């Protein structure tokens, strides 16, 4: 019966709530209240990259920390050298509503997607030296929001149809599909060992997924509106989420509950992107009021501002050696801070 | 050296190509088409066009007096539209199609218009409004079986204005109903506030020929206002 199932769900949620309540013997703030603050943190722009004709929706650094890829709503995908500001490649697309990028960890492939519900895969190292489309992955029923390589032959995607999928490139068909969300899936993040990943999905919840066997292990709540960005702490045992209610939060995978909140009274606008630092001591977030804020991740205090853009900040990233930070926004410019 | 100069040469060739493509990008006008199930946006497409399953978006191209228009129509998505609409904030205009003869779903269209007018990322974009299927409305009004004031009680006291300019020979009842229905939209287009964007309403039928010319004229006015706000004359 429907009513008995609803009652049982309520009882199970009550038991889960009490079990989580038994574990809150302290808080992050009472313990870390004897740590010296990092101090004022100040950064300035070393490079400005010009050439896109419209908004910028995505970027992603290479694993050597020198090359990067970016996508615009002109209909182009550009690959840049960032020590000299030379252009290495400029690839034109079949559809101009592109919304994501990824760069393979080997350096041989790039991928993109958007409002055409298809994931396109481009080979960079061919015998003639030409970039031509290698693959077109089809089967979703809503726009593609994010995608990330695991290796040269496997990839993971999230769409606006409430699912996630794992694809095998050579054969061309899905191998596993992950279901359970109710609304659009907005962001996606991989674990350092690539055995687990987390998804944030525009219904105020986040989920932890097991790649090989294929079930949802844990579900995290606590926001009050949609979730736009997510990432992993370098340790691998925590993650951070940014919402449309003007708040960032920090969640732990072994205590199974919220751990920290970062918000301020003057900030009443949403969050577009989130990322961490190499040691994990700084958290960087980009906002809809055109600038980025730098937060202390163990004490929740604003310790810096990055302010050089004249429109909505849309993407943000940090290299694998920790040297630079890249930001891009709706005004067509990318900037590199150090 | 012997490599850095080659890198500079390659970057120069890429820049040449981008400078070639900029000219074509900045010379075409882009339009977004919105409608509903009972509206006739498909016949608008099928009339001005000649002039992979699970696909997310369709496009059509046409050209009037040597100006090029690209029109986009969304295909296979879901109902919720508050996330993929944000990526349409740079278009020249939004063409909004309404079915004007049904009386049961006009309030839903009014709510849609209110949401599109007042959104944060769509405040500078003008709307061209097509009130479709005039012949069905005229027949239904002449029938006398369904009353408008069962859905809009204010129609009980409305009277057609003394300064109006009707069509040559139309029965006054049809004129009164048409003027009332158009008023309903221009109110939410004047009470909204601001005053940067404008709405251009037309009445069209199921068999017509002049819609491309109308789009042409409205886009001319939009561009002139933009050029008047770009040269610091306001």
């Amino acid at each position, epitope marked *: 019966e429907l009513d008995q199932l609803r009652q049982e769900a309520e009882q199970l949620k009550n038991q889960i709530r009490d079990a989580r309540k038994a574990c809150a013997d302290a808080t992050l703030s009472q313990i870390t209240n004897n740590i010296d603050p990092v101090g004022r943190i100040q950064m300035r722009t070393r490079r400005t990259l010009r050439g896109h004709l419209a908004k910028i929706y995505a970027m992603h650094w290479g694993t050597d920390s020198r090359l990067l890829v970016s996508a615009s709503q002109d209909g182009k995908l550009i690959i840049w050298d960032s020590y000299t500001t030379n252009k290495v490649h400029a690839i034109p697309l079949r559809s101009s509503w592109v919304m994501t990028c990824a760069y393979a960890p080997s350096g041989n492939y790039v991928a993109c997607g958007g409002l055409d519900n298809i994931c396109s895969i481009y080979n960079l190292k061919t015998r003639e030296g030409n970039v031509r489309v290698s693959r077109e992955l089809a089967g979703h029923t809503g726009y593609l929001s994010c995608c990330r390589f695991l290796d040269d032959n496997q990839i993971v995607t999230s769409s606006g149809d409430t699912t996630c999928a794992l694809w095998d490139i050579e054969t061309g068909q899905q191998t596993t599909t992950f279901t359970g969300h*109710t*609304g659009d899936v907005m962001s996606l993040s991989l674990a350092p060992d690539t055995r687990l990943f987390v998804s944030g999905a*525009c*219904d*105020a919840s986040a989920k932890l997924w097991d790649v090989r066997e294929g079930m949802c292990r844990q579900t995290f*709540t606590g926001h*009050e*509106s*949609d979730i736009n960005a997510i990432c992993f702490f370098p340790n691998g045992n925590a993650f951070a989420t940014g919402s*449309d*209610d003007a708040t960032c939060r920090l969640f732990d995978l072994r205590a199974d509950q919220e751990l920290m909140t970062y918000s301020h009274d003057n900030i*009443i606008c*949403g969050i577009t992107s989130v990322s961490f630092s190499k040691s994990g001591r700084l958290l960087l977030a980009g906002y809809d009021d055109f600038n980025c804020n730098v937060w202390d991740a163990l004490k929740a205090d604003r310790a810096g501002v990055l302010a050089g853009h004249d429109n909505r900040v849309s993407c943000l990233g940090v290299t694998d050696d920790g040297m630079a930070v890249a930001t891009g926004s709706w005004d067509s410019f990318l900037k590199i801070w150090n | 050296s012997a490599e850095d100069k080659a890198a500079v040469e390659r970057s120069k060739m890429i820049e040449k190509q981008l400078q070639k493509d900029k000219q074509v990008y900045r010379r075409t006008l882009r339009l977004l088409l919105l409608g509903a199930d009972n509206s006739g946006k498909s016949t608008i497409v099928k009339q001005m066009r000649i002039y992979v399953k699970t696909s997310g978006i369709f496009e059509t191209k046409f050209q009037v007096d040597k100006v090029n228009f690209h029109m986009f129509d969304v295909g296979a998505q*879901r*109902d*919720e*539209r*508050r996330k993929w609409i944000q990526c349409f904030n740079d278009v020249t205009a939004i063409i909004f199609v309404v079915d004007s003869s049904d009386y049961n779903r006009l*309030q*839903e269209a009014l*709510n849609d218009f*209110k*949401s599109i007018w*007042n*959104n*944060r990322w769509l405040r500078t974009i003008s709307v061209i409004l097509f009130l479709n299927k005039q012949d069905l409305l005229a027949e239904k009004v002449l029938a006398g079986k369904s009353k408008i004031e*069962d*859905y*809009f*009680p204010e129609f009980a006291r409305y009277t057609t204005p003394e300064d109006a300019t009707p069509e040559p020979g139309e029965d006054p009842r049809v004129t009164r109903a048409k003027y009332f229905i158009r008023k309903e939209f221009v109110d939410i287009s004047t009470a909204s506030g601001d005053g940067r964007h404008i709405c251009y309403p037309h009445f069209t039928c199921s068999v017509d020929t002049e819609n491309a010319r109308r789009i042409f004229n409205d886009c001319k006015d939009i561009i002139l206002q933009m050029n008047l706000r770009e040269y610091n004359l306001v």
Partner: nanobody
Framework: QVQLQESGGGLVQPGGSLRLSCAAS????????MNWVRQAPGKGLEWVSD????????SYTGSVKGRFTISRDNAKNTLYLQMNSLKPEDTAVYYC?????????????????????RGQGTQVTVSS
């Protein structure tokens, strides 16, 4: 956990009166604009009325003006609807809906595709 619980409902004879109420939990109630929607047998979701952040602006649909009234109580986080002079065409299920984001003035929330911030509903029958 965004939760919205409706109360009220039942069966009345034509011309009767009812009061529906909704209690909200899991967000800051006073930052949001609120709506009432309903669904009828054989129909889809229809929009009934809405109220603003403080109560200064109120709006109704053309078929209920003069009969239905809407109100907030921000100290108790409750939303109220008073229904008078009920007609047989008012038998339906009623839901309370919340806007997606705070501090805004537009809505996207009659979708059948499982809008997330909405309650389960309550039954209103007007027959004799």
């Amino acid at each position: 956990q965004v939760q919205l619980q409706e109360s009220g409902g039942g069966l009345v004879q034509p011309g009767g009166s009812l009061r529906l109420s909704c209690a909200a939990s899991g967000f800051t109630f006073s930052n949001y604009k609120m709506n009432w929607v309903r669904q009828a047998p054989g129909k889809g979701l229809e929009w009934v009325s809405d109220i603003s952040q403080s109560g200064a602006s109120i709006s109704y649909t053309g078929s209920v003006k003069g009969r239905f009234t809407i109100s907030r109580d921000n100290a108790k986080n409750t939303l109220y609807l008073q229904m008078n002079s009920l007609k047989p065409e008012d038998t339906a299920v009623y839901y309370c809906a919340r806007c997606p984001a705070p501090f805004t003035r537009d809505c996207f929330d009659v979708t059948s595709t499982t809008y997330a911030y909405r309650g389960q509903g309550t039954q209103v029958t007007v027959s004799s």
